From a paper:
The 22nd genetically encoded amino acid, pyrrolysine, plays a unique role in the key step in the growth of methanogens on mono-, di-, and tri-methylamines by activating the methyl group of these substrates for transfer to a corrinoid cofactor. A substrate:corrinoid methyltransferase catalyzes the demethylation of the specific methylamine, and subsequently transfers this methyl group onto an associated corrinoid protein. In summary, we have determined the structures of native [name], and its complexes with a substrate analog, sulfite, and its physiological relevant corrinoid protein, MttC. These structures have provided new insights into the mechanism of activation of pyrrolysine that is distinct from the previously determined MtmB structure, and details of the key steps in the pyrrolysine-mediated transfer of methyl groups from methylamine substrates to the cobalamin cobalt in corrinoid proteins.
The 2.5 Å structure of [name] reveals that the protein exists as a D3-symmetric homo-hexamer, although based on the strong protein contacts between pairs of twofold related subunits, the structure is perhaps better considered a trimer-of-dimers. A C-terminal loop (residues 396–452) that directly follows the TIM-barrel domain in the sequence forms extensive contacts with a twofold related [name] subunit leading to formation of tightly associated [name] dimers. The dimer is further stabilized by interactions provided by an N-terminal β-strand (β2, residues 17–19). The major interaction is provided by an N-terminal α/β subdomain (residues 23–81) which lies near the threefold axis and is positioned on the opposite side of the TIM barrel relative to the dimerization loop. An α-helix (α3, residues 71–80) from this α/β subdomain interacts with the threefold related α helices on the other two dimers forming a triangle. A lone water appears to hydrogen bond the pyrroline imine and this water is in-turn stabilized by hydrogen bonding interactions with the hydroxyl group of Tyr364 and the main chain carbonyl of Gly110. Notably, the orientation of the Gly110 carbonyl is achieved by its participation in a Gly110-Thr111 cis peptide-bond. Based on the [name] structures, the mechanism of TMA addition to pyrrolysine to [name] appears to be much simpler than that of MtmB—involving only a single conformation of the pyrroline ring. One possibility is that Tyr364-Wat-Pyl334 form a proton shuttle that aids in the generation of the positively charged TMA-pyrrolysine adduct by formation of the tyrosine anion. It should be noted that the water that hydrogen bonds the pyrroline imine nitrogen in the native [name] structure is absent in both the sulfite-bond [name] and the [name]-MttC complex.
Residue numbers in the entry:
A (entry chain D), C (entry chain A), D (entry chain F): 2 to 495
B (entry chain C): 2 to 494
The structure:
């Protein structure tokens, strides 16, 4: 009869992308342990220095330099959890961050401009808190955007109050998905904590168990931890708020031209932050992240739509998998000023390498202009791209059924599979893009001979006009607004 | 002192892309050997059927179905060369096609329309032998295009002369790079042989030794070998011209919806061709090719800029490496009607996968509109994209030098590497795109706020107006031109 | 949201069992190649010797010793197909034999006695043609019995006609499954070809395309190919009949005591048979088979229900996979004289090793008494055993779905999965034995306190009395039956 | 000359069985860690909750639910010893339990009924303290039974005294092999400690250095730790008594139908016990154990002679080897009510998988009726089966010697190996079962046509009548018997 008994079989599910051998991973590690001991790392916050000192680090109090011994890096790595869950106000949006290759996406964060349509053209203008609400609504709709990362700055609130706290409630209000704050303020973490506690009716345990808010911080390249960064880490750990320690080194600028050497600088900085985190509160939820890229000597810019950004982010994901931590890297980025042929290429180049490598969170969707501008058109374009990427990540599934010899035989020479029952059952198996155009020249011309950007634009308009976002309870929202008012007051009363 | 003695070290040069385990490759293989025996393959050319029969295949002379035993597949694979060199008129354009991961690129082939600027916009018009000449010049300039593949059809010669023979001399004349004929005619292969024989001053040995010409043929899916195809294979092997057996199956159409099954249909078709080739002339140069894709039931078309094409082309390179043969697959393709955001995406999606997998030749550069139109703008864009893919393929080189600890220590905390000597020696190390814009908004606007398409268009212009292509010797050209005329004369008969 | 994107993932489907490293496989091989050149093999059939000589073998005509060079062994292996299909009269019984781990089972063959209940107990008596007809019917029912191998000898025909030809038509008439003749007679192969040709209305092409008959032969240990063995090979290749070159070596008797040495003897013998085949007709369907076992120096018998037999068969399956050929090995065998506790153990020991190893066909089902007797009871029992083995061969399928963390969480602490919808959907997922009793003492005693043996017996009766077999066309049969009568007359004509 | 210089050669000693890739193991791990945090584990004992809380666990005192952070699992796994020795009164019975593949067997534990021969037939009757003594004497004789595990309950002591304490001295007295108590009482652990201390004449150090006693506890599925379990873990750790954290989950009942999901449940449960142990006393000797099985909805029982049981037990060994701990799993089990064809099969099915997988201890020998009954016949039978399993585990040793080409060449074509000197020297190499019958029909019938069951019954009678057990020193036994009396006296006064 047809067999239904197969001895042990070796299989490959998806697509494997390799950049290192264990030997090489260790080489990078040793080099990092070497850097951590000399020069070491400049920890500007005194409270952080005391944490390091207490636990074994040598601390030069006049130069603020800390030398982290390898055993503390080991201890930290054994304390950090291998996974944690990001919650949304809508449980269906909960996103998992786990060591391994489960890839997820989030939008770029955080620009100072927005790419919008004025009088028959796309004009890049300064962003305002209002823009955040709109983008939050769009991302709430975009399926492939697992959670929300502060897209643009509420520049209009600058100097007027606690802008960072405004950048907390606006997002939480305009989307039910998890919120990741790219621009947190160390001294104001208590407000973020209070906002979330307010959402959960004053129940801090609830807030800790179902965190709807997390934050990011960047070590200062090369080899420094600013006062703000140290406080974000320490307060994140103590309040139970997921903290993303993301690097921002620059090859040929703040780190070696070579990528391996750059990863070393990145590794030293990120590990220092994670160590501080675990030393403050053992078991603190943390990300091993990066947006480190290459500096373009010949242009005077730090291109982030280049193959180097893709390779570096992919490498960082491999390093996080090597260390047992969840990763958060830059991807789906571009240096193009408009949603053109360039944006498409770069977005795909910088997203595919990190995705195939297994980055747990790839951020950059919707970004344009080397991380300066945010485009709603590019956001929906990128979202559709991730759908194509997820299909590719399916690789080739090999099984008696997928080989389908009987089908090939039933059809026979010179026929077609259109009528076949198996075929009609797999009607939804192939990739089905939302915006990408797969029509004959005719149908496309008759539709207006529109390009992707314009098609995307029409999509944005529809979403913003007809998408419903799960609103926060009328009363709870007031409790939350109260915290923002309190923050603005404290800010203005100097 | 500084170390200068390290024990055995395991390294990864480049970026490795894996899609199969050996057990899965075998499973696919068995499925194919199963299909080759039942239903088997329908060979239309009687000469080919005789070749197959003479060697052991069962040939039903009424249905024309040929059943190929597995031992013949093995014999064919033991005969086919693992590598061969493609020659251009200019030795500097020589390209190797070898089993493994050495990647190369070639333009698409062959469209019927051309996307060109008209009265303020890009208008897609039908192709002519003149268009071929222009593209050949553009590609002759594009560094990441190793050899030239027939881009568009010389439609203006249809029913007026031997179109295929015109499509042979025009390319050879307009570019010093090797030429790959996508639309050869079985009966006219001798014209081609002579064209080349002429180029080498009437020396056939030199033509065989330094082939500047090669052909492509497609088995008819599912499981068929048309008369034209068998003849291209037979004469190709007999004349010493590399033949590319490239599949054109369609998931949901001529092969199962599942990619694995599709790969089986493909494997059966391509191998049957390769078997014929080796049976004809043991040692004939051949390519394990593919442009197989999926059928969008929902859009009534066959998207070729999809993640599916990329996967298929990637898997075929792996099957090729598994069978010990050079590969030629679709890649750097798109379904967009214009060089927009969509084009850039699909071009990269379909090129990155086959490239990282190690496809020896990825073709599709310059193509748009599901393989209907060719675009010089997209072509130069693609060319720039390939430069970026090549940087990506460099991966992360790990060595004491690249780890650069001493540099990190010398620069120290809070400083920068700008003035570092090592940094200045590596000024050309980073990727440096030709078209892609890496400037800030200021400088970009100050340049007219141009998108990639226009920037590219301007490049096309500059190239077509100034690039110098090494021309064939006047005398020699007459000899070749003669064969074309002779062939056209015959056509009118 | 819930993840739906995973980077390359290494998986293990089923259970893998390993016995050798590539270095050890090669070691066995070199040993084999050395033995084939010295002392070589005694080919008693002059026609086969000729075939060998013509292709390059040194043949000593006065001793019949043929030394086979390694390049011929290589040539044969490259010529032999990696797979082929065994057809039944009922296409639904078709069975694939392919290099790899696709396992299948067939009954034992061929005994000279039958274990059956007489008057209050089991009595083992010599077999008769009628026994074959009943065992064929039984096996037609048993699902895990892919095809049918000549169970016992039609001993009552001895001395009256062509017993081997009777042994062909009876099986084919009593089951619609493919028939594997274990006692073919080199000289009568033409009769078998004709029976099958008759079944297909005189179409030899159809007979070659849909083989319902295949045969087995044994090299003579140590290192000999008898005339009968050579003729079965030569004619099978020439008539398009799948031939099983199966060894019957014996550790301590016809090969070294060590199992490696034994595999070397087995290897030389089996490969010589395969070479002959491919040299006779390139591409001839052949099996790499074995029923080689160890001799019990202490008991003066050849135990076939021992771990040694299980190990040998498993190793042979690995050697077959190593050489790229389908395997046919002894398994599910016992040395017990009755279907008892010993039976169950030995049957399981000797079937599990070869199954996990990946043997393409495991024969031995129904056998007892060291290969002398066939038991219908033990046959239905073995069939049930094969179901449990098929379940075990599933191993642990690891996927997000099978890990079911949500189910565990939804059910929570101190509760059960009985009402969970997922649970009721998998009502047929667990193993469900046909005979093995899983009832509480109460229900068991209430059913008669019957042991597996008698429960098995009751099943036999039921199947024999009610199972329906697809009959052969009355007229086609007549034509086949005629071939038998013809052979019987020629036989008597001495 | 003959070679005696061979470069690096890769070899395989034994039979390797594989079920998981490292990725799959990790996947089972993450799922388990996720479950240890939500829903977490219900620890009923208040002393245990304190132990957890003190070390960083979130403990909900109202629900008694403990959430174990991944860093504590890691810590416990780093503290637990990779190996430890089980002592017997006779140093020769000392059994090592070490992370890896060194397999050992022990009898089942613990039934409520015994399967014996009354008046012409086998009758299943309730057990008594005397039955423990007998079975202990039988297991003392069985060589493949490394140590003794409380086989049946001393029911005749129920309600009239400290049953468990009687179930301690009796075993120790009736066998000189290590004793594993399957049903220890948390509150009476001090009694066991004193009994052992008594054996070593008051030297508590010796008792700790040469443990002749160890115990087992079962987490309550799903996700629960009873007061008794916790006390066993804690006292065991503090007194220096090896503790076996053994799961008893059940697919489709207290855990998901899928095997993977069931493993997760098992993991969460067992690891919680191990964490408790290490936190109580770092370095405490423990086992990663299991007897988790499937539930047959179609039969209303939890079959333990199923392929599922074998798979689960084998998986638990692989997981243990992954975590670096010694394993103790169920195997050599059957659902049959009598020692018949079924018993033999299941026993082998469920012992071979874990054995080939490397379980450090497989318990179940002598058991019948889904874990309800203990059969001395099935015990000696199982013990013999293990001897066959041990031979199978030899796999194929490949060396110039075992390949024995010179031997093959010496004997030559068509000859015999019996007379060969090498063969005579290897007469004890082949498997030599004690009960399994390998005689030709004649000799067997002459011996009575006895099946394995009856043959076993005879060996039982012979052992029980003639086997000698090294007795405990008369004086020492007095002190020991005293503790038991003191325990009983205590039981009565309440
Ligand atoms: Na796959
Ligand atoms: Na590298
Ligand atoms: Na598995
Ligand atoms: Na071995």
């Amino acid at each position: 009869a047809k067999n239904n008994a197969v001895a042990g079989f070796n299989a490959l599910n998806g697509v494997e992308l390799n950049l290192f051998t264990t030997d090489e991973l260790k080489a990078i590690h040793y080099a990092t342990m070497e850097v951590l001991m000399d020069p070491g790392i400049q920890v500007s916050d005194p409270e952080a220095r005391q944490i390091f000192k207490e636990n074994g680090c040598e601390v030069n109090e006049k130069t603020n330099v800390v030398k982290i011994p390898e055993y503390l890096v080991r201890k930290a790595l054994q304390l950090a959890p291998s996974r944690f869950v990001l919650w949304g106000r809508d449980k269906k949006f909960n996103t998992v961050q786990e060591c391994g290759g489960k890839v997820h996406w989030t939008c770029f964060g955080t620009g100072v401009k927005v790419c919008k349509y004025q009088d028959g053209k796309y004009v890049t203008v300064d962003s305002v808190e209002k823009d955040i609400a709109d983008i939050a609504k769009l991302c709430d709709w975009a399926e492939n955007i697992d959670y929300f990362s502060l897209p643009v700055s509420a520049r209009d609130i600058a100097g007027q109050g606690a802008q960072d706290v405004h950048e907390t409630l606006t997002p939480l209000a305009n989307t039910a998905k998890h919120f990741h704050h790219i621009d947190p303020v160390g001294e104001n973490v208590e407000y973020y904590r209070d906002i979330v506690k307010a959402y959960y009716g004053g129940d801090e345990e609830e807030a800790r168990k179902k965190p709807i808010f997390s934050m990011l911080l960047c070590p200062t390249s090369p080899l420094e931890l600013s006062v703000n960064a140290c406080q974000v880490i320490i307060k994140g750990a103590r309040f139970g708020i997921p903290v993303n320690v993301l690097s921002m080194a620059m090859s040929g600028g703040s780190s070696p031209v070579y990528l391996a050497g750059t990863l070393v600088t990145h590794n030293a900085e990120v590990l220092s932050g994670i160590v501080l985190a675990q030393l403050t509160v053992p078991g603190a939820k943390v990300w091993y992240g990066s947006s480190t890229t290459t500096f373009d000597l010949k242009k005077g810019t730090a291109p982030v739509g280049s193959p180097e950004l893709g390779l570096i982010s992919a490498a960082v994901a491999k390093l996080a998998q090597f260390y047992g931590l969840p990763s958060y890297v830059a991807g789906s980025x571009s240096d193009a000023k408009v949603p053109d042929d360039q944006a498409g290429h770069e977005k795909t180049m910088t997203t595919l390498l990190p995705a195939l490598a297994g980055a747990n969170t790839i951020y950059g969707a919707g970004m344009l202009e080397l991380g300066m501008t945010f485009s709603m058109e590019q956001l929906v374009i990128d979202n559709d791209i991730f759908s194509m990427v997820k299909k590719a990540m399916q690789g080739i599934p090999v099984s008696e059924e997928t080989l389908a010899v009987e089908s090939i035989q039933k059809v026979g020479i010179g026929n077609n599979f259109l009528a076949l029952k198996q075929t009609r059952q797999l009607v939804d198996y192939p990739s089905n893009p939302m915006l990408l155009d797969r029509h004959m020249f005719g149908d496309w011309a008759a539709a207006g001979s529109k390009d992707l950007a314009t098609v995307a634009h029409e999509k944005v308009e529809d979403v913003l006009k007809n998408h419903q976002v799960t609103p926060i309870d009328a009363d709870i929202f007031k409790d939350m607004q109260a915290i923002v008012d309190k923050a603005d007051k404290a800010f203005r009363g100097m």
